[PDB]
Design a protein around this ligand. Structure first.
Ligand SMILES: *P(=O)(O)OC[C@H]1O[C@@H](n2cnc3c(=O)[nH]c(N)nc32)[C@H](O)[C@@H]1O
Ligand SMILES: [Mn+2]
Ligand SMILES: [Mn+2]
Lengths: 503, 169
């Protein structure tokens, strides 16, 4: 369609939200919406125009089309929702949520929609150190992080792992890390799902997934993944920050972003292949082949969810490993134990996962399978699925910006529970593709500006750092302000990077 | 015929002098691929004079994103046979099997892939690749590939065959 013919399905609901009306794509059961303020609005509509510009071959699906395609999946309730970090993905949009009524027998589960980086998450650690303590040893600390944390393609875990260790980690999650001494009991208490999904079945994880995951357990990954030393610059909610252990501007924190690695990628890949085979039996019509799905109660659906939970336990073990290695690096530089440095977990929250949750839909409580691609839980105060320390503040939300701008901590709100099924985002999202970033930016300009900002960097391939430049992502403040002004998340802390390691 | 839709942008993997020397002594690989625009990830666009070559160039495009494959020595040859229900799933499984060769067991990376046959009546494929085990001491670090996706996947089997595949990174 022409660009103008597409806009006939787009209505601005309010200052921070747009409506995608039925008919945008075929067979929409519900409408689509996406939350963007003035600054983020242009990026989203320019993607609709420029994703498939010509009448020939090539191109990709813009996020609005993917939000609509998701709205066509059987069993969806309320809305297909794009969160402020929304941009084009491979099935679901990045920053796209969809919930399905589990008492609807036609309700499906989409493994290609959940994403391949199953249970990828952001973990925030705190310290009793200030920026003044780190600046004399900043470059040393970044190197110590780089030496302790394996990053990039081909990297392997330093601590040897065998198949039995992986089998136990798939079942136990953070309980395995606690048992083997790589995690503290306080880490589990302030981790989402307490770092373990009980219905995980290692027998639903393929031999291929286990062979890929075994060498990569204890590795950060690549792409958007990072381990970043940060400094508190502003405290918008002192009560929430105090509950999180943040006392003063200048306090040093560490933010870690990593997922299920090759095991989770294979689990999703294996499931997508099974769904395609199942759709020959029960032929569910989907607009995009990546959205291949099966009924939730189907054997394929149940096997995926159990393997997905095991991949989630893998990701919690990996992020515990990242925390253990981060604590070792801080200990070596400052010649002080990690406990004496107060290197505790503030929170661990995940994206790219489907969860069974209770939500009110049109006045009736219902049991929903909530798909969150590139988006996280943002549960309100007094929610039963939130640790006791955050019952009054609400669930902590971690939105990472870039290695050269800002990151934010927020809290879930009751209005977010009502409007988005308690969903918010995990980061700013991309404004430029990696390919477009190469055309607009030079690797030396990115490295130098970061040095001029006093940010220390260790990356696996410095001459590709332009593809991860701050100019490649949305303004994180505009994303965070959209969440705040829409009432789906509440600002608590603003952080500033001083050192980052990436792969 | 020009099949590239963009001007050539060659990814720089920060080669050491020894790696530059390893690349210098083998014939250069003919590259019929490009990395195109996708907001969250990257779109592989590869082409050839046959459908077989379009497939093998896509695999080489995928491996070319993980490292400089010119630094890979042809010390061992590996076979990849797979099948699908159509050209898209054949392409999906072809790239997935090669990704698995790199990601597990022998951790093999080829400097070149050749598709020996594509059975278009049953959607089956035979291909080989020559190279060595991937090593951080020998090969530079590019970008790790998470998975193959069906997003906007396009297979054109006419006069100048070409494919478009978005991969998760
Ligand atoms: P999800 O789609 O996994 O994207 C993650 C999210 O993280 C942010 N990001 C990317 N690089 C960095 C970095 O070096 N440091 C921080 N704090 N945050 C980063 C992006 O906003 C991306 O969208
Ligand atoms: Mn992630
Ligand atoms: Mn990706």
């Amino acid at each position: 369609r022409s660009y103008n013919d597409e806009l006939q399905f787009l209505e601005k609901i309010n200052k921070n939200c747009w409506r995608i009306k039925k008919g945008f794509v075929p067979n929409m059961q519900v409408e689509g919406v996406f939350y963007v303020n003035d600054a983020l609005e242009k990026l989203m509509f320019e993607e609709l125009r420029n994703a498939c510009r010509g009448g020939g071959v090539g191109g990709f699906l813009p996020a609005m089309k993917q939000i609509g395609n998701v709205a066509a999946l059987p069993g969806i309730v309320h809305r297909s929702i794009g969160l402020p970090d929304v941009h084009s993905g491979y099935g679901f949009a990045i920053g796209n949520m969809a919930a399905f009524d589990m008492n609807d027998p036609e309700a499906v589960v989409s493994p290609g929609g959940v994403g391949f980086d199953i249970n990828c998450g952001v973990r925030l650690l705190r310290t009793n150190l200030d920026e003044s303590d780190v600046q004399p040893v900043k470059e040393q600390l970044a190197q110590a992080m780089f030496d302790h944390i394996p990053v990039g393609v081909g990297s392997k875990g330093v601590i040897p792992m065998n198949a039995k260790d992986l089998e136990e980690a798939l079942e136990m999650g953070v309980d395995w890390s606690l048992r083997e001494g790589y995690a503290w009991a306080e880490d589990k208490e302030h981790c989402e799902e307490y770092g373990r999904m009980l219905q995980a079945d290692p027998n639903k994880v393929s031999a291929r997934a286990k062979k890929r995951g075994l060498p990569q357990l204890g590795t950060l990954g690549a792409g958007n993944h990072y381990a970043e030393i940060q400094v508190v610059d502003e405290i918008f909610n002192e009560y929430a920050a105090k509950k999180m252990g943040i006392d003063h501007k200048g306090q040093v924190c560490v933010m870690i972003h990593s997922g299920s690695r090759g095991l989770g990628h294979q689990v999703a890949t294996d499931a997508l292949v099974a769904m395609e085979k199942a759709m020959k039996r029960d032929k569910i019509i989907v607009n995009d082949r990546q959205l291949a799905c099966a009924r939730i109660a189907s054997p394929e659906g149940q096997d995926y969810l159990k393997g997905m939970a095991a991949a989630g336990n893998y990701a919690w073990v990996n992020r515990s490993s990242m925390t253990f290695l981060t604590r070792q690096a801080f200990a070596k530089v400052f010649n002080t134990t990690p406990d004496d440095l107060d290197l505790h977990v503030i929170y661990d929250v995940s994206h790219n996962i489907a969860k069974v949750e209770q939500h009110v839909v049109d006045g009736k409580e219902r049991t929903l399978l909530v798909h969150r691609k590139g988006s996280t839980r943002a549960f309100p105060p007094h929610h039963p699925l939130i640790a006791v320390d955050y019952q009054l503040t609400g669930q902590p939300v971690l939105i990472g910006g870039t290695m050269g701008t800002c990151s934010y901590v927020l809290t879930g709100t009751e209005q977010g529970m009502t409007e988005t099924f308690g969903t918010t985002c995990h980061g700013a999202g991309r404004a430029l593709s990696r390919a477009k970033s190469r055309r607009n930016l030079d690797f030396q300009d990115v490295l130098d500006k970061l040095a001029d900002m006093g940010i220390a960097i260790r990356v696996a391939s410095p001459k590709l750092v332009m593809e991860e430049a701050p100019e490649s992502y949305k303004n994180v403040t505009d994303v965070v302000n959209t969440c705040h002004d829409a009432g789906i998340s509440k600002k608590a802390i603003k952080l500033r990077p001083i050192a980052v390691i990436k792969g | 015929a020009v099949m590239a839709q963009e001007e050539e942008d060659v990814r720089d993997y920060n080669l050491t002098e020894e790696q530059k020397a390893i690349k210098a002594k083998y014939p250069p690989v003919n590259r019929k691929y490009e990395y195109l625009d996708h907001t969250a990830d990257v779109q592989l666009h590869a082409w050839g004079d046959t459908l077989e070559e379009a497939f093998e160039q896509c695999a080489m495009a995928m491996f070319g994103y993980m490292t400089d494959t010119g630094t890979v020595e042809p010390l061992q040859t590996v076979e990849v046979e797979t099948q699908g229900d159509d050209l898209q799933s054949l392409l999906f499984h072809f790239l997935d099997e090669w990704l698995y060769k790199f990601s597990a067991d022998e951790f093999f990376i080829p400097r070149e892939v050749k598709v020996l046959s594509i059975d278009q009546r049953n959607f089956k494929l035979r291909s080989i690749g020559w190279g060595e085990e991937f090593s951080l001491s020998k090969h530079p670090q590019g970008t790790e590939v998470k998975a193959i996706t069906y997003s906007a996947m396009q297979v054109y089997n006419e006069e100048n065959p070409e494919v478009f595949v978005i991969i998760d990174i």
